[PDB]
Design an enzyme around this catalytic site. Structure first.
Site, PDB file in Angstrom:
ATOM      1  N   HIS B 192     -51.558   8.919  16.611  1.00 36.90           N
ATOM      2  CA  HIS B 192     -53.218   9.208  16.505  1.00 36.90           C
ATOM      3  C   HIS B 192     -53.445   9.868  15.118  1.00 36.90           C
ATOM      4  N   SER B 196     -52.489   2.311  14.378  1.00 30.91           N
ATOM      5  CA  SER B 196     -51.563   1.282  14.619  1.00 30.91           C
ATOM      6  C   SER B 196     -50.996   0.996  12.974  1.00 30.91           C
ATOM      7  N   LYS B 218     -58.268  -6.707  27.243  1.00 33.24           N
ATOM      8  CA  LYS B 218     -57.223  -7.308  26.901  1.00 33.24           C
ATOM      9  C   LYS B 218     -55.904  -6.786  27.562  1.00 33.24           C
ATOM     10  N   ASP B 219     -55.749  -5.329  27.778  1.00 29.04           N
ATOM     11  CA  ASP B 219     -54.761  -4.745  28.280  1.00 29.04           C
ATOM     12  C   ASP B 219     -54.667  -4.877  29.758  1.00 29.04           C
ATOM     13  N   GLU B 262     -25.908  -4.062  35.840  1.00 28.39           N
ATOM     14  CA  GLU B 262     -27.233  -4.621  35.844  1.00 28.39           C
ATOM     15  C   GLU B 262     -27.157  -5.324  34.376  1.00 28.39           C
TER      16      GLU B 262
HETATM   17  C1  HEM Z   1     -37.953   4.231  34.512  1.00 29.09           C
HETATM   18  C2  HEM Z   1     -37.390   4.561  35.736  1.00 29.09           C
HETATM   19  C3  HEM Z   1     -36.704   4.152  36.807  1.00 29.09           C
HETATM   20  C4  HEM Z   1     -35.742   3.212  36.722  1.00 29.09           C
HETATM   21  C5  HEM Z   1     -35.496   2.248  35.553  1.00 29.09           C
HETATM   22  C6  HEM Z   1     -35.100   3.329  38.159  1.00 29.09           C
HETATM   23  C7  HEM Z   1     -34.050   2.243  38.313  1.00 29.09           C
HETATM   24  C8  HEM Z   1     -33.892   1.829  39.889  1.00 29.09           C
HETATM   25  C9  HEM Z   1     -33.409   0.510  40.405  1.00 29.09           C
HETATM   26  C10 HEM Z   1     -32.865  -0.484  39.323  1.00 29.09           C
HETATM   27  C11 HEM Z   1     -33.178   0.486  41.432  1.00 29.09           C
HETATM   28  C12 HEM Z   1     -32.713  -0.657  42.208  1.00 29.09           C
HETATM   29  C13 HEM Z   1     -32.091  -0.262  43.583  1.00 29.09           C
HETATM   30  C14 HEM Z   1     -32.245  -1.835  44.400  1.00 29.09           C
HETATM   31  O1  HEM Z   1     -32.931  -2.526  43.878  1.00 29.09           O
HETATM   32  O2  HEM Z   1     -31.926  -1.731  45.554  1.00 29.09           O
HETATM   33  C15 HEM Z   1     -33.819   1.822  42.014  1.00 29.09           C
HETATM   34  C16 HEM Z   1     -33.944   2.172  43.456  1.00 29.09           C
HETATM   35  C17 HEM Z   1     -34.365   3.472  43.572  1.00 29.09           C
HETATM   36  N1  HEM Z   1     -35.205   4.154  42.952  1.00 29.09           N
HETATM   37 FE1  HEM Z   1     -34.949   4.337  40.974  1.00 29.09          FE
HETATM   38  N2  HEM Z   1     -35.708   3.879  38.700  1.00 29.09           N
HETATM   39  C18 HEM Z   1     -36.706   4.733  38.140  1.00 29.09           C
HETATM   40  C19 HEM Z   1     -37.423   5.840  38.568  1.00 29.09           C
HETATM   41  C20 HEM Z   1     -37.457   6.020  39.926  1.00 29.09           C
HETATM   42  C21 HEM Z   1     -38.657   6.682  40.260  1.00 29.09           C
HETATM   43  C22 HEM Z   1     -39.712   7.122  39.540  1.00 29.09           C
HETATM   44  C23 HEM Z   1     -38.241   7.009  41.722  1.00 29.09           C
HETATM   45  C24 HEM Z   1     -39.252   7.839  42.554  1.00 29.09           C
HETATM   46  C25 HEM Z   1     -40.521   7.997  42.138  1.00 29.09           C
HETATM   47  C26 HEM Z   1     -37.182   6.373  41.985  1.00 29.09           C
HETATM   48  C27 HEM Z   1     -36.368   6.417  43.222  1.00 29.09           C
HETATM   49  C28 HEM Z   1     -35.535   5.312  43.714  1.00 29.09           C
HETATM   50  C29 HEM Z   1     -34.937   5.296  44.862  1.00 29.09           C
HETATM   51  C30 HEM Z   1     -34.813   6.405  45.862  1.00 29.09           C
HETATM   52  C31 HEM Z   1     -34.214   4.215  45.012  1.00 29.09           C
HETATM   53  C32 HEM Z   1     -33.231   3.750  45.930  1.00 29.09           C
HETATM   54  C33 HEM Z   1     -33.845   2.378  46.609  1.00 29.09           C
HETATM   55  C34 HEM Z   1     -32.908   1.287  46.203  1.00 29.09           C
HETATM   56  O3  HEM Z   1     -31.787   1.375  45.834  1.00 29.09           O
HETATM   57  O4  HEM Z   1     -33.298   0.055  46.284  1.00 29.09           O
HETATM   58  N3  HEM Z   1     -36.502   5.766  40.833  1.00 29.09           N
HETATM   59  N4  HEM Z   1     -34.113   2.453  40.911  1.00 29.09           N
HETATM   60  C1  HEM Z   2     -42.052   4.323  28.482  1.00 25.98           C
HETATM   61  C2  HEM Z   2     -41.926   4.081  27.005  1.00 25.98           C
HETATM   62  C3  HEM Z   2     -43.102   3.960  26.179  1.00 25.98           C
HETATM   63  C4  HEM Z   2     -44.262   3.970  26.188  1.00 25.98           C
HETATM   64  C5  HEM Z   2     -45.258   4.533  27.245  1.00 25.98           C
HETATM   65  C6  HEM Z   2     -44.944   3.490  24.728  1.00 25.98           C
HETATM   66  C7  HEM Z   2     -46.285   3.476  24.600  1.00 25.98           C
HETATM   67  C8  HEM Z   2     -46.585   2.973  23.430  1.00 25.98           C
HETATM   68  C9  HEM Z   2     -48.009   2.653  22.827  1.00 25.98           C
HETATM   69  C10 HEM Z   2     -49.256   2.677  24.013  1.00 25.98           C
HETATM   70  C11 HEM Z   2     -48.118   2.311  21.825  1.00 25.98           C
HETATM   71  C12 HEM Z   2     -49.579   1.732  21.211  1.00 25.98           C
HETATM   72  C13 HEM Z   2     -49.508   0.183  21.072  1.00 25.98           C
HETATM   73  C14 HEM Z   2     -48.943  -0.460  20.004  1.00 25.98           C
HETATM   74  O1  HEM Z   2     -48.730   0.298  19.113  1.00 25.98           O
HETATM   75  O2  HEM Z   2     -48.337  -1.595  20.061  1.00 25.98           O
HETATM   76  C15 HEM Z   2     -46.950   2.390  21.084  1.00 25.98           C
HETATM   77  C16 HEM Z   2     -46.587   1.779  20.034  1.00 25.98           C
HETATM   78  C17 HEM Z   2     -45.362   2.102  19.370  1.00 25.98           C
HETATM   79  N1  HEM Z   2     -44.224   2.249  20.208  1.00 25.98           N
HETATM   80 FE1  HEM Z   2     -43.856   2.486  22.256  1.00 25.98          FE
HETATM   81  N2  HEM Z   2     -43.850   3.256  23.937  1.00 25.98           N
HETATM   82  C18 HEM Z   2     -42.668   3.462  24.626  1.00 25.98           C
HETATM   83  C19 HEM Z   2     -41.594   3.182  24.257  1.00 25.98           C
HETATM   84  C20 HEM Z   2     -41.277   2.971  23.168  1.00 25.98           C
HETATM   85  C21 HEM Z   2     -39.846   2.412  22.629  1.00 25.98           C
HETATM   86  C22 HEM Z   2     -38.582   2.418  23.432  1.00 25.98           C
HETATM   87  C23 HEM Z   2     -39.868   2.449  21.159  1.00 25.98           C
HETATM   88  C24 HEM Z   2     -38.578   2.073  20.329  1.00 25.98           C
HETATM   89  C25 HEM Z   2     -38.479   2.032  19.122  1.00 25.98           C
HETATM   90  C26 HEM Z   2     -41.138   2.543  20.867  1.00 25.98           C
HETATM   91  C27 HEM Z   2     -41.837   2.359  19.577  1.00 25.98           C
HETATM   92  C28 HEM Z   2     -43.107   2.478  19.261  1.00 25.98           C
HETATM   93  C29 HEM Z   2     -43.561   1.961  17.848  1.00 25.98           C
HETATM   94  C30 HEM Z   2     -42.781   2.063  16.689  1.00 25.98           C
HETATM   95  C31 HEM Z   2     -45.006   2.010  17.863  1.00 25.98           C
HETATM   96  C32 HEM Z   2     -45.723   1.780  16.768  1.00 25.98           C
HETATM   97  C33 HEM Z   2     -47.165   1.523  16.714  1.00 25.98           C
HETATM   98  C34 HEM Z   2     -47.653   0.464  15.935  1.00 25.98           C
HETATM   99  O3  HEM Z   2     -46.682   0.155  14.972  1.00 25.98           O
HETATM  100  O4  HEM Z   2     -48.948   0.290  15.656  1.00 25.98           O
HETATM  101  N3  HEM Z   2     -42.120   2.860  22.008  1.00 25.98           N
HETATM  102  N4  HEM Z   2     -46.032   2.864  22.295  1.00 25.98           N
HETATM  103  C1  LIG Z   3     -53.553   0.321  19.439  1.00 29.23           C
HETATM  104  C2  LIG Z   3     -53.449   1.075  20.680  1.00 29.23           C
HETATM  105  N1  LIG Z   3     -53.548   2.394  20.694  1.00 29.23           N
HETATM  106  C3  LIG Z   3     -53.590   2.901  21.833  1.00 29.23           C
HETATM  107  C4  LIG Z   3     -53.651   4.598  21.666  1.00 29.23           C
HETATM  108  O1  LIG Z   3     -53.665   5.160  20.372  1.00 29.23           O
HETATM  109  C5  LIG Z   3     -53.341   2.449  23.246  1.00 29.23           C
HETATM  110  C6  LIG Z   3     -53.391   3.273  24.276  1.00 29.23           C
HETATM  111  C7  LIG Z   3     -54.314   3.362  25.229  1.00 29.23           C
HETATM  112  C8  LIG Z   3     -54.542   4.253  26.135  1.00 29.23           C
HETATM  113  C9  LIG Z   3     -53.202   4.843  26.741  1.00 29.23           C
HETATM  114  O2  LIG Z   3     -53.387   5.561  27.899  1.00 29.23           O
HETATM  115  C10 LIG Z   3     -52.455   5.483  28.890  1.00 29.23           C
HETATM  116  C11 LIG Z   3     -52.824   4.701  29.789  1.00 29.23           C
HETATM  117  C12 LIG Z   3     -51.877   4.513  30.930  1.00 29.23           C
HETATM  118  C13 LIG Z   3     -50.725   5.032  30.907  1.00 29.23           C
HETATM  119  C14 LIG Z   3     -50.533   6.071  29.837  1.00 29.23           C
HETATM  120  O3  LIG Z   3     -49.144   6.533  29.739  1.00 29.23           O
HETATM  121  C15 LIG Z   3     -49.100   7.921  30.177  1.00 29.23           C
HETATM  122  F1  LIG Z   3     -50.340   8.098  30.495  1.00 29.23           F
HETATM  123  F2  LIG Z   3     -48.841   8.464  29.213  1.00 29.23           F
HETATM  124  F3  LIG Z   3     -47.949   7.942  30.952  1.00 29.23           F
HETATM  125  C16 LIG Z   3     -51.105   6.031  29.025  1.00 29.23           C
HETATM  126  C17 LIG Z   3     -52.198   4.802  25.830  1.00 29.23           C
HETATM  127  C18 LIG Z   3     -52.162   4.023  24.564  1.00 29.23           C
HETATM  128  C19 LIG Z   3     -53.194   1.018  23.226  1.00 29.23           C
HETATM  129  O4  LIG Z   3     -53.147   0.552  24.312  1.00 29.23           O
HETATM  130  C20 LIG Z   3     -53.344   0.358  21.735  1.00 29.23           C
HETATM  131 CL1  LIG Z   3     -53.158  -1.311  21.824  1.00 29.23          CL
END
Ligand code: HEM
Ligand code: HEM
Ligand SMILES: Cc1nc(CO)c(-c2ccc(Oc3cccc(OC(F)(F)F)c3)cc2)c(O)c1Cl
Lengths: 98, 370, 158, 74, 57
Positions: B192, B196, B218-219, B262
């Site tokens: 911010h 972007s 759009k989002d 996986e």
């Molecule tokens: C980025 C975040 C997370 C990833 C990448 C992830 C990954 C996974 C994956 C790949 C499975 C596959 C199990 C299946 O398909 O049978 C799973 C199951 C599960 N997830 Fe996670 N998880 C995430 C976050 C969470 C969250 C936020 C919760 C609860 C709020 C959670 C609770 C569980 C539990 C209890 C299972 C067992 C159910 C199952 O094995 O099918 N996980 N998770």
């Molecule tokens: C849960 C994970 C993430 C969330 C919630 C998130 C969220 C965001 C959002 C909302 C934007 C603005 C949209 C955009 O710029 O296209 C952004 C931009 C960006 N994100 Fe992610 N992001 C995540 C993971 C990552 C990861 C893994 C990378 C790895 C490099 C990354 C790198 C960037 C960069 C470099 C930008 C630059 C924005 C621009 O170039 O204008 N973010 N991220």
């Molecule tokens: C250019 C550009 N910029 C911004 C913010 O500067 C955004 C943008 C707008 C709103 C956002 O708010 C959110 C909405 C839902 C979940 C979210 O995650 C959270 F809340 F942090 F876990 C953020 C987050 C990012 C965007 O979508 C684009 Cl395209």
């Protein structure tokens, strides 16, 4: 032979298809922000409008017709005098510090 | 009054030349909430004990009123998560966003957070690949000298995976997405201060526009396609990505013939599998990820984008192939036809990044006289 | 200053958002132009427009009778005080005989006005302001001037 | 940061119209599809050939894998 | 006036009405869309579902 390639690359980069020039697309950093601050009005606004339409057409993914494109011989290097002036001062500012 | 912070999300200046790529940057905000939302209700019935866990999954898939969905909106949802990343991460390479040095490094720590989270998320239900998938990945840290056996035993709560090692994850796993939920806000904060980074690479300050009408919908449109391409999996093919073995109960005295975690590790798992040495392949793995932090010290062209660098385009999408190769080559067993490819492809990965992408701008600067 | 009556004025005096603005009503053959003109520093355009739009929606919806009798009593002291001389008269004649036809004796305007109560305004402004397709103009440091869509979205309350 | 002190503009004019006064999808088929092609011709050359080669190493990688399991004449 | 313009000035103008309209249409829409798919789903799987073998037992 070389110069047949610069003229070709400059046609493949795309940025003659958007009414732009070469200095337009440069990465902006502190070294460059200095120069763009230093430009005159007549040329500065002329930088703005080249950008301001290329964006709106990178929005649509449209371009200009072939006539309005840019031509390699007309790729004016308007920024280079103002830039190299800077990095002269930079290296004068660094080596004087050592 | 704190609503005024949503100047960030309402009245924000942003460009007008914007693709649908950057929707992917926003969907994670939905996927992160969507996954937790599902997973929470999901975990009202899970059990962190061995004898009941796999039953405690089937307690959902059968008896619960529409509980069977929530497993798959969650699981395959966790895969649509990554599909946005590996389009979102490859983006900034192809549009030069890594220059925001304060931000790209955050883009790492989110990833490593997930790739140690999602791992924990696969092992909870004891699918006979859970266990060995937990064993294969976790055992590698034993490769370290003088601490490897100590840490891995320390995280194995003993000497191998067991009831304790389950429960040490279900709490480490049900927590971190909040740590992602927070760090994500940081990931936006440093943005911010600059906004972007257009596809061109140019400061489009002259042509910044609002955000509430335009990129919002759009989002949503971006979100709508996501749910679509997430409902299809759960409704029409949940068995697709998740290996079938994960429905078998786990038994340490019987391995499957073929093992793979996986699908999404496989670009990285394969890299280790290529190296016949144990340790020297590991440090390639961790470097296969942390290399992204090493890129901004390798931005050669005084341009930014790759829209205006046709040579680097030829090398960029080339990297996508090598990944799509290493995504698959790891997914297949260890035999002579493929090992010859991993020794090449894994080297190509390091090679394209650290030699040739700089080399392009080193040239392209010179084709145009700077 | 702040003690003024029109909320659009007391605000702009209070917060010093602008330097000048005026409404109007231009009228042509089978159409006209209704709106306003305002002049303000670049850091204050968006704030003024919200207030302006806030009032129209307020008038189309909640037009206090006490606020009507003001404008009625304001208008009377325009047409009259406008007609303090001969040249204003002779404009109104020579303009009346090509716009309305007959010149209007001022006791006819007055009767038309006394018909106007708060019920009519809420109908009129609904017809010509609410949700319509406005026309916008700009000349200067308008870095803050919102997009047309944001203007229209600010046209209807709720 | 916000609108008002970003940067300078001088002597530029903008013409923009309501949406209500215009169709949403004008010339969607007419002008778009030629623009899809021109969009496509400018990317296809430096996008496919890696993926083309992948189809061959997904090809030869399986065929050469299949043979190795089939016995030899011995 | 078309249906559209007659539709605008009645419903889609006053926002209080515009929300009243949607729940109404949705409340009836729930009553049709279910009947549709449940019959199409019945139709495509004719001779397979329980209600088709509900008389024998
Ligand atoms: C980025 C975040 C997370 C990833 C990448 C992830 C990954 C996974 C994956 C790949 C499975 C596959 C199990 C299946 O398909 O049978 C799973 C199951 C599960 N997830 Fe996670 N998880 C995430 C976050 C969470 C969250 C936020 C919760 C609860 C709020 C959670 C609770 C569980 C539990 C209890 C299972 C067992 C159910 C199952 O094995 O099918 N996980 N998770
Ligand atoms: C849960 C994970 C993430 C969330 C919630 C998130 C969220 C965001 C959002 C909302 C934007 C603005 C949209 C955009 O710029 O296209 C952004 C931009 C960006 N994100 Fe992610 N992001 C995540 C993971 C990552 C990861 C893994 C990378 C790895 C490099 C990354 C790198 C960037 C960069 C470099 C930008 C630059 C924005 C621009 O170039 O204008 N973010 N991220
Ligand atoms: C250019 C550009 N910029 C911004 C913010 O500067 C955004 C943008 C707008 C709103 C956002 O708010 C959110 C909405 C839902 C979940 C979210 O995650 C959270 F809340 F942090 F876990 C953020 C987050 C990012 C965007 O979508 C684009 Cl395209």
């Amino acid at each position: 032979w070389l110069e047949g390639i610069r003229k070709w690359y400059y046609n493949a980069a795309g940025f003659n298809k958007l009414g732009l020039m070469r200095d337009d697309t440069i990465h902006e950093n502190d070294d460059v922000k200095e120069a763009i601050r230093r430009l005159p009005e007549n040329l500065y606004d002329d930088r703005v409008f080249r950008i301001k339409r290329a964006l709106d057409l990178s929005m649509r993914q449209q371009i200009l017709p072939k006539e309005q494109w840019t031509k390699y011989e007309e790729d004016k290097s308007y920024l280079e005098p103002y830039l190299k002036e800077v990095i002269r001062e930079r290296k004068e500012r660094e080596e004087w510090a050592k | 009054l704190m609503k005024i912070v949503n100047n960030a999300f309402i009245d924000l200046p942003a460009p007008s030349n914007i693709s649908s790529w950057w929707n992917f940057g926003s969907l994670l905000g939905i996927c992160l909430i969507l996954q937790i939302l599902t997973g929470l209700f999901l975990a009202m019935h899970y059990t962190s004990d061995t004898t009941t866990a796999f039953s405690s999954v089937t307690h959902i898939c059968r008896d619960v009123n529409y509980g069977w969905i929530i497993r798959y909106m969650h699981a395959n949802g966790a895969s649509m998560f990554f599909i946005c990343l590996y389009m979102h991460v490859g983006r900034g390479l192809y549009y030069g966003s890594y220059t925001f040095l304060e931000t790209w490094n955050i883009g790492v720590i989110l990833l490593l957070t997930v790739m140690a989270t999602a791992f924990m998320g696969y092992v909870l239900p004891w699918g006979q690949m859970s266990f060995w998938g937990a064993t294969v990945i976790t055992n590698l840290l034993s490769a370290i000298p003088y601490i490897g056996t100590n840490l891995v035993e320390w995280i194995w709560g003993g000497f191998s995976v067991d009831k304790a090692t389950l429960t040490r994850f279900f709490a480490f796993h049900f927590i971190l997405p909040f740590i992602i939920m927070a760090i994500a806000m940081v990931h936006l904060l440093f943005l911010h201060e600059t906004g972007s980074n257009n596809p061109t690479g140019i400061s489009s300050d002259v042509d910044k526009i609002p955000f509430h009408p335009y990129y919002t919908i759009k989002d949503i449109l971006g979100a709508l396609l996501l749910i679509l391409a997430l409902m299809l999996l759960v409704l029409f093919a949940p068995d697709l990505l998740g290996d079938p073995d994960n429905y078998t109960p786990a038994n340490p005295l019987n391995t499957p013939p073929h093992i793979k975690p996986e699908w999404y590790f496989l670009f990285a798992y394969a890299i280790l599998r290529s190296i016949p040495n144990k340790l020297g392949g590991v440090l390639a793995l961790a470097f296969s990820i942390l290399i992204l932090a090493l890129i901004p010290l390798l931005h050669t062209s005084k341009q930014r984008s790759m829209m205006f660098r046709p040579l680097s385009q030829c090398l960029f999408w080339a990297l996508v192939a090598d990944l799509l190769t290493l995504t698959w080559i790891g997914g297949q067993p260890v035999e002579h036809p493929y090992i010859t490819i991993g020794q090449l492809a894994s080297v190509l990965y390091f090679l394209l990044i650290l030699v040739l992408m700089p080399t392009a701008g080193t040239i392209e600067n010179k084709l145009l006289k700077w | 200053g702040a003690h003024l009556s029109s909320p659009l004025a007391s605000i702009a005096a209070t917060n010093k958002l602008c330097q000048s603005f005026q409404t109007f009503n231009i009228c042509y053959a089978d159409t006209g132009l209704l709106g306003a003109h305002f002049v303000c520093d670049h850091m204050s355009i968006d704030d003024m427009m919200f207030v302006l739009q806030g009032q129209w929606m307020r008038l189309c919806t909640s037009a206090t009778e006490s606020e009507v009798l003001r404008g009625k009593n304001l208008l009377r002291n325009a047409l009259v005080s406008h007609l303090d001389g001969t040249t204003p008269v002779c404009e109104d004649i020579g303009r009346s005989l090509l716009t309305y036809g007959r010149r209007i004796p001022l006791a006819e305007w007055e009767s038309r006005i006394a018909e106007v109560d708060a019920r009519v305004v809420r109908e009129v402004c609904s017809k010509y302001f609410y949700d319509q397709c406005p026309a916008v103009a700009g000349f200067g440091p308008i870095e803050q001037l919102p997009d047309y869509n944001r203007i229209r979205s600010g046209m209807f309350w709720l | 940061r916000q609108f008002g002190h970003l940067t300078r503009v001088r002597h530029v004019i903008t013409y923009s119209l309501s949406p209500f006064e215009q169709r949403a999808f004008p010339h969607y088929f007419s002008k778009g599809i030629p623009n899809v092609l021109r969009r496509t011709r400018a990317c296809i050359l430096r996008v496919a050939p890696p993926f083309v080669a992948f189809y061959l190493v997904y090809t030869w990688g399986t065929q050469e894998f299949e043979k190795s399991k089939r016995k030899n004449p011995a | 006036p078309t249906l559209t313009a007659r539709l605008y000035s009645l419903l889609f103008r006053r926002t209080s009405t515009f929300a009243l309209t949607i729940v109404v249409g949705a409340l009836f829409f729930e009553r049709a869309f279910d009947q549709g798919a449940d019959a199409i789903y019945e139709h495509i799987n004719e001779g397979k579902l329980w209600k088709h073998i509900k008389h024998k037992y």
